[PDB]
């Protein structure tokens, strides 16, 4: 077996739980893949530029995290896929010697949902473009909270909603697809999302793996909640699909993945 270097871009990166999943899978897969992938954590510095370092790494392929995402997008050199509609990227494959981006966010998160009807997104990153894309395309009706006018316009070109002020509405899907988490803190006022708990169907964090403040108001309030661990898995899942280039499905890899973490 020939080796392939991949990795995940991040920062930080060191909460990811990807290594662990992708190498599982790379290991498992090697005699179907007919080579041995090795996939390794990349803290990247902000000044760096994702495809000199793919590149000067000499990787077969990566992941993207925060807050790298809609930089991913905008130095590939080809983009496919839903990736297109999310103005986002969180999957890179080297093809004949093109880097070309992949969205897997979408679906995995998606996937992930155990009859919803509305959503709100807190935040405007990557995450959240590719979650408003995603649920838009399955009509539920998307309104969107930011703090800012950084990326209205894109929202705005998906028809969602778009808010800085907490709309005073009920929603089935509250999301936090904010870095709130990551600083352990609510991305709202308790009062508002205290609000928004008690008349929702579901509280969702984006965050893995630990009880978030997000969560674990709505865990007092008795709100159904869930943590992004399953949409981790999904995601992957999908990424490695493309990592394989689509020779092992997602649902292969993903058992393979959930059954590990």
């Not at 996937?111 to 807190?122: E, G, P, T, V």
């Not at 399955?138 to 309104?143: A, K, M, R």
């Not at 969602?160 to 907490?166: G, I």
Request: charged content about 20%; hydrophobic content about 40%.
């Amino acid at each position: 077996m020939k080796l392939k270097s991949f990795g995940v871009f991040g920062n930080p990166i060191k909460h990811s739980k990807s290594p662990l999943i992708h190498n599982a899978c790379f290991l498992t897969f090697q005699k179907e893949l007919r080579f041995l992938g090795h996939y390794h954590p990349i803290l990247l510095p902000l000044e760096s530029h994702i495809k000199s370092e793919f590149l000067h790494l000499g990787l077969s392929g990566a992941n993207v995290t925060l807050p790298f995402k809609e930089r991913a997008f905008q130095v590939c050199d080809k983009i496919k896929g839903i990736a297109l509609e999310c103005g986002a990227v969180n999957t890179l494959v080297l093809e004949n010697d093109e880097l070309v981006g992949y969205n897997t966010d979408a679906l995995g998160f998606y996937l992930s949902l155990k009859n919803y009807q509305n959503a709100l997104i807190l935040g405007a990153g990557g995450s959240a473009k590719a979650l408003a894309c995603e649920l838009k395309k399955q009509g539920l009706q998307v309104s969107v909270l930011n703090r800012s006018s950084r990326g209205l316009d894109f929202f705005q070109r998906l028809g969602c909603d778009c808010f800085m002020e907490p709309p005073k509405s009920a929603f089935d899907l509250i999301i936090n697809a904010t870095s709130a988490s990551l600083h352990n803190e609510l991305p709202l006022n308790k009062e508002v999302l205290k609000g928004y708990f008690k008349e929702g169907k579901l509280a969702y964090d984006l965050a893995y793996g630990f009880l978030t403040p997000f969560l674990s108001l709505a865990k007092e309030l008795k709100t159904p909640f869930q943590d992004g661990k399953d949409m981790l898995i999904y995601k992957a899942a999908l990424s490695f699909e493309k990592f394989s280039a689509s020779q092992i499905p997602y649902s292969k890899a993903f058992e393979v993945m959930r059954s590990v973490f």
